[PDB]
Amino acid sequence: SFVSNGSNTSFSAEDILAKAQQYAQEHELNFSGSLSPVDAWQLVQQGEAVLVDVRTNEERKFVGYVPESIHVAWATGTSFNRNPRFLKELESKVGKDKTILLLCRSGNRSTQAAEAAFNAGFEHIYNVLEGFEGDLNEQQQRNQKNGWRIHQLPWQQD
Amino acid sequence: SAEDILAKAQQYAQEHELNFSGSLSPVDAWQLVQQGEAVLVDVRTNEERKFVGYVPESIHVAWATGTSFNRNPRFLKELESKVGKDKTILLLCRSGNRSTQAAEAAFNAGFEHIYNVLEGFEGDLNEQQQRNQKNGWRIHQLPWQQD
C-alpha cells in the first residue's frame, strides 16, 4: 500500500481539457467545453474521456461508428424522434461524474445533448466539434468539408 | 449507344451465368439513366437513402426493410406497379448483394429486362471495414445527394 502512490501515466489530458474549457468560456457555452475530432480521439484512446455517440441507431448501422464508443441516442429513427430517456441512459451507462465527449453527425445534435446534460447535473460534458460526418457541401454531400471521417480517425461499419 | 451498353451488359450475364438480363458498371448505368433509356431502381432501405444518400430520380423499391433487412413481401408488386415488367430496369443496392437477389427474383417473376448495377452505391468493405474506399457509385463521383 505505502510504496505505491496509485496509477502512473505517460499521458497528460489537462492541456487538451484546459483548451476545451477555454473554448466554452470564450464562446459562452452552457457546458464544459468543445474540442476537435483529433483532440477528442487523443483523449479517448488513452482512456481519459468517454466517447458517447448520440446519433441514431440507423446512422451507426449504415454510416459507421467509432469502436468502443457508448451509444446513447439523442433522437431515434429517420424522423429524429427525441429520446426522452436520453438523460436516464446517459446516467446509467456512464454517469454524471465522468468526462464525457458527445459525438453526433455534425455539431448540432451533440450541442443540444450537451446543453441538456449539463443542465441535468452532468459535471464534465464536452461537444466534439464537426461531428462524425461534418457539414453538408453545396453538392449536398457530407464528409467533404470537415468531421471525424475526413480527418481519417478510426471508424468502421458493416 | 444505349443499345451497345445493354448488349455488353447482356454479354456479361452470359459469361457469368447470371439468372437475369445483365450487369453493368456504375458509369455505364448512369449513362443510360441520364438519357432516359433505363429506370434506376434503388432497392436499399429508406434508412440508407436518408443517412447514406441516394441517386436523384431513382425509384425506391426496397428489397428488404429496416436495420434488420426484413424481407419485403411486396417487392415484386411494388416493382410492377411503380415501374412495370416491360421496362429496362437497373437495380442498385449498397454493394450488389441485395440487388443480385432482387434481380433474380424479378427475372423469375416475369420482368423482361432486369439488370444489376455492379459495385452498388457504396461498394465493398475494405480491410478497415470501411465502404466507399474501393469501388461503388460514390467513389466513381457519379451524381448523388443526401440530407
CSV table of C-alpha atoms in Angstrom, one decimal:
chain,number,residue,atom,x,y,z
A,1,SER,CA,0.0,0.0,0.0
A,2,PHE,CA,2.5,2.7,1.1
A,3,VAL,CA,5.2,2.3,-1.7
A,4,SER,CA,2.6,2.7,-4.5
A,5,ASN,CA,1.1,6.3,-4.9
A,6,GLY,CA,-1.6,4.9,-7.3
A,7,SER,CA,-1.7,4.5,-11.1
A,8,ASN,CA,1.2,6.1,-13.2
A,9,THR,CA,0.7,7.6,-16.7
A,10,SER,CA,2.9,8.7,-19.6
A,11,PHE,CA,-0.1,10.9,-20.9
A,12,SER,CA,-1.5,14.2,-19.7
A,13,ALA,CA,-5.1,15.3,-20.6
A,14,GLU,CA,-5.1,18.6,-18.8
A,15,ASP,CA,-3.8,20.7,-21.6
A,16,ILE,CA,-6.5,19.4,-24.1
A,17,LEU,CA,-9.2,19.8,-21.4
A,18,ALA,CA,-8.0,23.3,-20.4
A,19,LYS,CA,-8.1,24.3,-24.1
A,20,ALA,CA,-11.6,22.8,-24.5
A,21,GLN,CA,-12.8,24.7,-21.4
A,22,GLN,CA,-11.3,27.9,-22.7
A,23,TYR,CA,-13.3,27.4,-25.9
A,24,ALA,CA,-16.5,27.1,-24.0
A,25,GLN,CA,-15.8,30.3,-21.9
A,26,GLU,CA,-14.8,32.3,-25.0
A,27,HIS,CA,-18.0,31.2,-26.7
A,28,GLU,CA,-20.1,31.4,-23.5
A,29,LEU,CA,-21.3,27.9,-24.0
A,30,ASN,CA,-23.5,26.3,-21.3
A,31,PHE,CA,-21.4,23.2,-20.9
A,32,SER,CA,-17.8,22.3,-20.0
A,33,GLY,CA,-16.0,22.6,-23.3
A,34,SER,CA,-15.6,21.8,-27.0
A,35,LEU,CA,-12.8,20.1,-28.8
A,36,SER,CA,-11.8,19.0,-32.3
A,37,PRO,CA,-12.2,15.4,-33.5
A,38,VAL,CA,-8.5,14.9,-33.4
A,39,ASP,CA,-8.2,16.1,-29.8
A,40,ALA,CA,-11.2,14.1,-28.8
A,41,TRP,CA,-9.6,10.9,-30.2
A,42,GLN,CA,-6.4,11.7,-28.4
A,43,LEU,CA,-8.2,11.7,-25.0
A,44,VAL,CA,-10.4,8.7,-25.7
A,45,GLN,CA,-7.7,6.4,-27.0
A,46,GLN,CA,-5.8,7.0,-23.7
A,47,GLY,CA,-8.9,6.2,-21.6
A,48,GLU,CA,-9.1,9.8,-20.3
A,49,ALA,CA,-12.6,10.5,-21.6
A,50,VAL,CA,-15.7,8.6,-22.6
A,51,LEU,CA,-16.8,9.0,-26.2
A,52,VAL,CA,-20.6,9.0,-26.3
A,53,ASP,CA,-22.3,8.6,-29.7
A,54,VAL,CA,-25.6,10.5,-29.6
A,55,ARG,CA,-26.6,9.6,-33.2
A,56,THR,CA,-29.4,7.3,-34.2
A,57,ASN,CA,-29.0,3.5,-34.4
A,58,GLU,CA,-29.7,3.9,-38.1
A,59,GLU,CA,-26.6,6.1,-38.5
A,60,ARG,CA,-24.4,3.7,-36.5
A,61,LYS,CA,-25.6,0.8,-38.7
A,62,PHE,CA,-25.3,2.4,-42.1
A,63,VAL,CA,-22.9,5.3,-41.8
A,64,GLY,CA,-20.5,3.8,-39.4
A,65,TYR,CA,-19.3,4.4,-35.9
A,66,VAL,CA,-16.2,4.8,-33.7
A,67,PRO,CA,-15.3,1.4,-32.0
A,68,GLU,CA,-15.7,1.4,-28.2
A,69,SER,CA,-18.0,4.4,-28.2
A,70,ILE,CA,-21.0,4.3,-25.9
A,71,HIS,CA,-24.3,4.7,-27.8
A,72,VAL,CA,-26.9,7.0,-26.1
A,73,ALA,CA,-29.3,8.3,-28.7
A,74,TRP,CA,-30.4,11.9,-28.5
A,75,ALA,CA,-33.0,11.2,-31.2
A,76,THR,CA,-34.1,8.0,-33.0
A,77,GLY,CA,-35.2,6.9,-36.4
A,78,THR,CA,-35.3,8.6,-39.8
A,79,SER,CA,-37.6,11.3,-38.4
A,80,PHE,CA,-35.3,12.1,-35.4
A,81,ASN,CA,-37.9,11.4,-32.7
A,82,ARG,CA,-36.5,12.8,-29.5
A,83,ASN,CA,-35.4,10.2,-27.0
A,84,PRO,CA,-37.0,11.1,-23.6
A,85,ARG,CA,-34.7,8.6,-21.8
A,86,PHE,CA,-31.5,10.2,-23.1
A,87,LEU,CA,-30.6,11.6,-19.6
A,88,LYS,CA,-31.5,8.4,-17.8
A,89,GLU,CA,-29.5,6.3,-20.2
A,90,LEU,CA,-26.5,8.7,-20.0
A,91,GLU,CA,-26.5,8.4,-16.2
A,92,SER,CA,-26.8,4.6,-16.1
A,93,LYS,CA,-24.4,3.8,-18.9
A,94,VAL,CA,-21.7,6.4,-18.0
A,95,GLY,CA,-22.5,8.6,-15.0
A,96,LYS,CA,-22.6,12.3,-14.1
A,97,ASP,CA,-19.1,12.4,-12.7
A,98,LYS,CA,-17.3,11.2,-15.9
A,99,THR,CA,-15.5,13.3,-18.5
A,100,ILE,CA,-17.9,12.8,-21.5
A,101,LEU,CA,-17.3,13.8,-25.1
A,102,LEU,CA,-20.6,13.9,-27.1
A,103,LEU,CA,-20.3,13.0,-30.8
A,104,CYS,CA,-23.1,13.3,-33.4
A,105,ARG,CA,-23.1,13.7,-37.2
A,106,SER,CA,-22.2,17.4,-37.1
A,107,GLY,CA,-22.0,19.7,-34.1
A,108,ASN,CA,-25.8,20.2,-33.9
A,109,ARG,CA,-27.4,17.3,-32.1
A,110,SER,CA,-24.3,17.0,-29.8
A,111,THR,CA,-24.7,20.7,-28.8
A,112,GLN,CA,-28.3,20.1,-27.9
A,113,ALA,CA,-27.4,17.0,-25.9
A,114,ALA,CA,-24.5,18.8,-24.2
A,115,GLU,CA,-26.8,21.7,-23.1
A,116,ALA,CA,-29.4,19.2,-21.8
A,117,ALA,CA,-26.9,17.0,-20.0
A,118,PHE,CA,-25.1,20.0,-18.3
A,119,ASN,CA,-28.4,21.4,-17.2
A,120,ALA,CA,-29.2,18.0,-15.7
A,121,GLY,CA,-26.1,17.9,-13.4
A,122,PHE,CA,-23.6,16.2,-15.7
A,123,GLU,CA,-20.3,17.9,-14.4
A,124,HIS,CA,-17.9,17.3,-17.3
A,125,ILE,CA,-19.8,17.5,-20.7
A,126,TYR,CA,-17.9,18.3,-23.9
A,127,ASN,CA,-19.0,18.8,-27.5
A,128,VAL,CA,-16.9,17.2,-30.3
A,129,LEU,CA,-16.7,19.9,-33.0
A,130,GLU,CA,-17.5,19.0,-36.7
A,131,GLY,CA,-19.1,15.6,-35.7
A,132,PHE,CA,-18.6,12.2,-37.4
A,133,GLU,CA,-19.5,13.3,-40.9
A,134,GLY,CA,-19.2,17.1,-40.8
A,135,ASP,CA,-21.2,19.8,-42.7
A,136,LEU,CA,-23.2,19.2,-46.0
A,137,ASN,CA,-21.4,20.8,-49.0
A,138,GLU,CA,-23.2,22.8,-51.9
A,139,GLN,CA,-23.4,19.4,-53.7
A,140,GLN,CA,-25.5,18.1,-50.8
A,141,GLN,CA,-22.7,15.7,-49.8
A,142,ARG,CA,-21.2,15.3,-46.2
A,143,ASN,CA,-17.6,14.2,-45.4
A,144,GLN,CA,-16.0,16.6,-47.9
A,145,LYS,CA,-15.5,19.6,-45.7
A,146,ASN,CA,-14.9,18.5,-42.1
A,147,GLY,CA,-15.6,15.8,-39.5
A,148,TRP,CA,-14.1,12.7,-37.9
A,149,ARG,CA,-14.0,10.7,-41.2
A,150,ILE,CA,-12.3,13.4,-43.3
A,151,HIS,CA,-9.7,13.6,-40.6
A,152,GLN,CA,-9.0,9.8,-41.1
A,153,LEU,CA,-9.7,9.0,-37.5
A,154,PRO,CA,-10.7,5.4,-36.6
A,155,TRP,CA,-14.2,4.2,-37.6
A,156,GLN,CA,-15.8,1.1,-39.1
A,157,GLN,CA,-19.2,-0.1,-40.5
A,158,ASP,CA,-20.7,-3.4,-41.7
B,1,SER,CA,-25.1,3.9,-77.6
B,2,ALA,CA,-27.7,2.6,-75.1
B,3,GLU,CA,-28.1,-0.5,-77.3
B,4,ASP,CA,-24.4,-1.1,-77.2
B,5,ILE,CA,-24.2,-0.7,-73.4
B,6,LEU,CA,-27.2,-3.1,-72.9
B,7,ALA,CA,-25.6,-5.6,-75.4
B,8,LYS,CA,-22.4,-5.5,-73.3
B,9,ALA,CA,-24.4,-6.0,-70.1
B,10,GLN,CA,-26.2,-8.9,-71.7
B,11,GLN,CA,-22.9,-10.4,-72.7
B,12,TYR,CA,-21.7,-10.0,-69.1
B,13,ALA,CA,-24.7,-12.0,-67.8
B,14,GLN,CA,-23.8,-14.8,-70.2
B,15,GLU,CA,-20.1,-15.0,-69.2
B,16,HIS,CA,-21.0,-15.1,-65.5
B,17,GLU,CA,-24.1,-17.4,-65.8
B,18,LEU,CA,-26.4,-14.8,-64.3
B,19,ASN,CA,-30.1,-15.6,-64.0
B,20,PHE,CA,-31.2,-12.1,-65.3
B,21,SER,CA,-30.6,-9.9,-68.3
B,22,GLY,CA,-27.3,-8.4,-67.5
B,23,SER,CA,-24.9,-6.4,-65.2
B,24,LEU,CA,-23.2,-3.1,-65.8
B,25,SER,CA,-20.8,-0.7,-64.2
B,26,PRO,CA,-22.0,2.4,-62.3
B,27,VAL,CA,-20.6,4.6,-65.0
B,28,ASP,CA,-22.5,2.7,-67.7
B,29,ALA,CA,-25.7,2.6,-65.6
B,30,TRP,CA,-25.5,6.4,-65.2
B,31,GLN,CA,-25.0,6.9,-68.9
B,32,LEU,CA,-28.2,5.0,-69.6
B,33,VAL,CA,-30.2,6.6,-66.8
B,34,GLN,CA,-29.1,10.2,-67.5
B,35,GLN,CA,-30.5,9.8,-71.1
B,36,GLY,CA,-33.8,8.3,-70.0
B,37,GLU,CA,-33.0,4.9,-71.6
B,38,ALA,CA,-33.3,2.9,-68.4
B,39,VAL,CA,-35.0,3.1,-65.0
B,40,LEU,CA,-32.8,3.3,-61.9
B,41,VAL,CA,-34.4,1.4,-59.1
B,42,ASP,CA,-32.9,1.8,-55.6
B,43,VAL,CA,-33.5,-1.5,-53.7
B,44,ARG,CA,-31.9,-0.3,-50.4
B,45,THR,CA,-33.7,0.7,-47.2
B,46,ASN,CA,-35.2,4.1,-46.5
B,47,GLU,CA,-32.6,4.3,-43.7
B,48,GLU,CA,-29.8,4.1,-46.2
B,49,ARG,CA,-31.3,6.6,-48.5
B,50,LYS,CA,-31.9,9.0,-45.6
B,51,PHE,CA,-28.4,8.7,-43.9
B,52,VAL,CA,-26.0,7.4,-46.6
B,53,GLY,CA,-27.5,9.2,-49.6
B,54,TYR,CA,-29.2,8.4,-52.9
B,55,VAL,CA,-29.1,9.0,-56.6
B,56,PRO,CA,-31.7,11.7,-57.6
B,57,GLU,CA,-34.7,10.5,-59.6
B,58,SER,CA,-34.1,6.8,-58.7
B,59,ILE,CA,-37.3,4.8,-57.8
B,60,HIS,CA,-37.3,3.3,-54.3
B,61,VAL,CA,-38.4,-0.3,-54.2
B,62,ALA,CA,-37.0,-1.9,-51.1
B,63,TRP,CA,-35.8,-5.5,-51.3
B,64,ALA,CA,-35.6,-5.6,-47.5
B,65,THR,CA,-36.6,-3.0,-44.9
B,66,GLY,CA,-35.3,-1.8,-41.6
B,67,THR,CA,-31.9,-2.0,-40.0
B,68,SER,CA,-32.5,-5.8,-39.8
B,69,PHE,CA,-33.1,-6.2,-43.6
B,70,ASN,CA,-36.6,-7.7,-43.1
B,71,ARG,CA,-37.5,-9.2,-46.5
B,72,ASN,CA,-40.1,-7.0,-48.2
B,73,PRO,CA,-43.1,-9.2,-49.2
B,74,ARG,CA,-44.4,-6.5,-51.5
B,75,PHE,CA,-41.2,-6.0,-53.5
B,76,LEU,CA,-42.4,-7.6,-56.7
B,77,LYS,CA,-45.8,-5.9,-56.5
B,78,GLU,CA,-44.2,-2.6,-55.9
B,79,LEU,CA,-41.7,-3.1,-58.8
B,80,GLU,CA,-44.6,-3.9,-61.1
B,81,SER,CA,-46.9,-1.0,-60.1
B,82,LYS,CA,-44.1,1.7,-59.9
B,83,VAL,CA,-42.2,0.6,-63.0
B,84,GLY,CA,-43.6,-2.4,-64.8
B,85,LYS,CA,-42.4,-5.7,-66.3
B,86,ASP,CA,-41.7,-4.3,-69.7
B,87,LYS,CA,-39.2,-1.6,-68.7
B,88,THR,CA,-35.4,-1.7,-68.8
B,89,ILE,CA,-34.6,-1.8,-65.1
B,90,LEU,CA,-31.3,-1.3,-63.4
B,91,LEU,CA,-31.3,-2.4,-59.8
B,92,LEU,CA,-29.0,-0.6,-57.4
B,93,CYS,CA,-28.1,-1.6,-53.9
B,94,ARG,CA,-25.3,-0.9,-51.5
B,95,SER,CA,-22.8,-3.4,-52.9
B,96,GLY,CA,-24.5,-5.7,-55.4
B,97,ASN,CA,-25.6,-8.5,-53.0
B,98,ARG,CA,-29.2,-7.4,-52.4
B,99,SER,CA,-29.5,-6.2,-56.0
B,100,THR,CA,-28.4,-9.6,-57.3
B,101,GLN,CA,-31.1,-11.3,-55.1
B,102,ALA,CA,-33.7,-8.8,-56.3
B,103,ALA,CA,-32.6,-9.2,-59.9
B,104,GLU,CA,-33.0,-13.0,-59.7
B,105,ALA,CA,-36.4,-12.7,-58.1
B,106,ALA,CA,-37.7,-10.1,-60.6
B,107,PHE,CA,-36.4,-12.1,-63.6
B,108,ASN,CA,-38.1,-15.2,-62.3
B,109,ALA,CA,-41.3,-13.3,-61.7
B,110,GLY,CA,-41.6,-12.2,-65.4
B,111,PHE,CA,-39.7,-8.9,-65.5
B,112,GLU,CA,-38.3,-8.9,-69.1
B,113,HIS,CA,-35.3,-6.6,-68.8
B,114,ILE,CA,-33.7,-6.8,-65.3
B,115,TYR,CA,-30.1,-5.6,-64.8
B,116,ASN,CA,-27.8,-5.4,-61.7
B,117,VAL,CA,-25.5,-2.3,-61.2
B,118,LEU,CA,-22.1,-3.7,-60.3
B,119,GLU,CA,-20.4,-2.5,-57.0
B,120,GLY,CA,-23.5,-0.9,-55.6
B,121,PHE,CA,-23.8,2.7,-54.3
B,122,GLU,CA,-21.1,2.3,-51.6
B,123,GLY,CA,-19.1,-0.7,-52.9
B,124,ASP,CA,-17.3,-3.5,-50.9
B,125,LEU,CA,-15.8,-3.1,-47.3
B,126,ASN,CA,-12.0,-2.6,-47.1
B,127,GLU,CA,-9.7,-4.4,-44.6
B,128,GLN,CA,-10.5,-1.5,-42.2
B,129,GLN,CA,-14.2,-2.5,-42.5
B,130,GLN,CA,-15.0,0.8,-44.3
B,131,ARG,CA,-17.0,1.1,-47.5
B,132,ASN,CA,-16.7,3.7,-50.3
B,133,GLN,CA,-12.9,3.3,-50.4
B,134,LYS,CA,-12.5,0.7,-53.2
B,135,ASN,CA,-15.4,0.8,-55.6
B,136,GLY,CA,-19.1,1.8,-56.0
B,137,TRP,CA,-21.2,4.7,-57.3
B,138,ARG,CA,-19.8,7.3,-54.9
B,139,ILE,CA,-16.1,6.6,-55.4
B,140,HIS,CA,-16.7,7.0,-59.2
B,141,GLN,CA,-18.0,10.5,-58.3
B,142,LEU,CA,-21.3,9.9,-60.1
B,143,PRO,CA,-24.3,12.1,-59.0
B,144,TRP,CA,-25.7,11.6,-55.6
B,145,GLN,CA,-27.1,13.6,-52.7
B,146,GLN,CA,-28.0,13.2,-49.0
B,147,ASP,CA,-29.5,15.4,-46.3
